[PDB]
């Protein structure tokens, strides 16, 4: 894993995603992290988000765990920070450029699709009760975003 | 020394600063370089915000490093 993980680091260092910065902590090649800024369109402008990663001891070949330390009231993420990513599913290549994953989350907010996510409660509220959603959206901003 | 800075705009350029300088000064140079004001200028690193009253040697960022620049868009 030390070699594989270092594989992405090469493409990451030489040229890391501009849409979002990321990199491993210390020389410990196992824990990865990233950040995302309000695309300047959705109700979260100026809201900085942080998400940690966890690589398996059996090589990426195993679905990696991801969570959201920041409290985002988006109709697609639960409380435990459960992010819905099809990549993890069959669309999980034992050798994928995590760089694409980060972008997937970026486009998610810049293009959501309220349907049957892991948060049907937020879906309904956002569905018609937009006025309220805006209240919590702005309230959850200063709470942890800022 | 030399240091790389990349913003959301995708803009990337090598800046020049001394290891004894303070984030308070570099902020003055970066803005004059791109033209972006300090209010919108921000410095992030592995999820660590740089303080205005801190020296490069303090954060031990070494040389040939890549700083994550973020734009603080207020709009209100």
Swiss-Prot record, chain A:
GO terms for cellular component: cytosol; endosome membrane; extracellular exosome; nucleoplasm; nucleus; plasma membrane. It is a peripheral membrane protein. Pathway: Protein modification; protein ubiquitination. Changing residue 86 to E/P: Has intermediate lysine reactivity. Phosphorylated by AURKB. Pfam families: UQ_con. The active site is at residue 84. Residues 1-146 form the UBC core domain. The keyword Ubl conjugation does not apply. It is found in: Cell membrane; Endosome membrane. Keywords: Apoptosis, ATP-binding, Cell membrane, Disulfide bond, DNA damage, DNA repair, Endosome, Membrane, Nucleotide-binding, Phosphoprotein, Transferase, Ubl conjugation pathway. Belongs to the ubiquitin-conjugating enzyme family. This is Ubiquitin-conjugating enzyme E2 D3. It comes from Homo sapiens (Human).
From Swiss-Prot, chain B:
Changing residue 68 to G: Loss of DTX3L-mediated polyubiquitination of histone H3 and H4. Changing residue 76 to A: Loss of ADP-ribosylation. The record marks 68 as: Essential for function. Changing residue 72 to G: No effect on ADP-ribosylation. It comes from the Eukaryota. Phosphorylated at Ser-65 by PINK1 during mitophagy. Phosphorylated ubiquitin specifically binds and activates parkin (PRKN), triggering mitophagy. Phosphorylation does not affect E1-mediated E2 charging of ubiquitin but affects discharging of E2 enzymes to form polyubiquitin chains. It also affects deubiquitination by deubiquitinase enzymes such as USP30. The record marks 54, 72 as: Interacts with activating enzyme. The modification (Microbial infection) ADP-ribosylthreonine is found at residue 66. The modification Phosphoserine is found at residue 65. There is a cross-link at residues 6, 11, 27, 29, 33, 48, 63 (Glycyl lysine isopeptide (Lys-Gly) (interchain with G-Cter in ubiquitin)). Exists either covalently attached to another protein, or free (unanchored). When covalently bound, it is conjugated to target proteins via an isopeptide bond either as a monomer (monoubiquitin), a polymer linked via different Lys residues of the ubiquitin (polyubiquitin chains) or a linear polymer linked via the initiator Met of the ubiquitin (linear polyubiquitin chains). This is Ubiquitin. The gene is UBA52. The chain holds residues 1 to 76 of 128 of the full protein.
């Amino acid at each position: 894993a030390l070699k594989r993980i270092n594989k992405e680091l090469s493409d990451l260092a030489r040229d890391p995603p501009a849409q979002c910065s990321a990199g491993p902590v210390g020389d410990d090649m196992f824990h990865w992290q990233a950040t995302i800024m309000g695309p300047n369109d959705s109700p979260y402008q100026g809201g900085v988000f942080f998400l940690t990663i966890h690589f398996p001891t059996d090589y990426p070949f195993k679905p990696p765990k991801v969570a959201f330390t920041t409290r985002i009231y988006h109709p697609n993420i639960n409380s435990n920070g459960s992010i819905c990513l099809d990549i993890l599913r069959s669309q999980w290549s034992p050798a994928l450029t995590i760089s694409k994953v980060l972008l997937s989350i970026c486009s998610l907010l810049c293009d959501p699709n309220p349907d049957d996510p892991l948060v049907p409660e937020i879906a309904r509220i956002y569905k018609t009760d937009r006025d309220k959603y805006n209240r919590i959206s702005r309230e959850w901003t200063q709470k942890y975003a800022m | 020394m030399q240091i790389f800075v990349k913003t959301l705009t995708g803009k990337t350029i090598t800046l020049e600063v001394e290891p004894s300088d303070t984030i308070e000064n570099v902020k003055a140079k970066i803005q004059d370089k791109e033209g972006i004001p300090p209010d919108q200028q921000r410095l992030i690193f592995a999820g660590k915000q740089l303080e205005d009253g801190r020296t490069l040697s303090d954060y031990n960022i070494q040389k040939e490093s890549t700083l994550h620049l973020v734009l603080r868009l207020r709009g209100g």
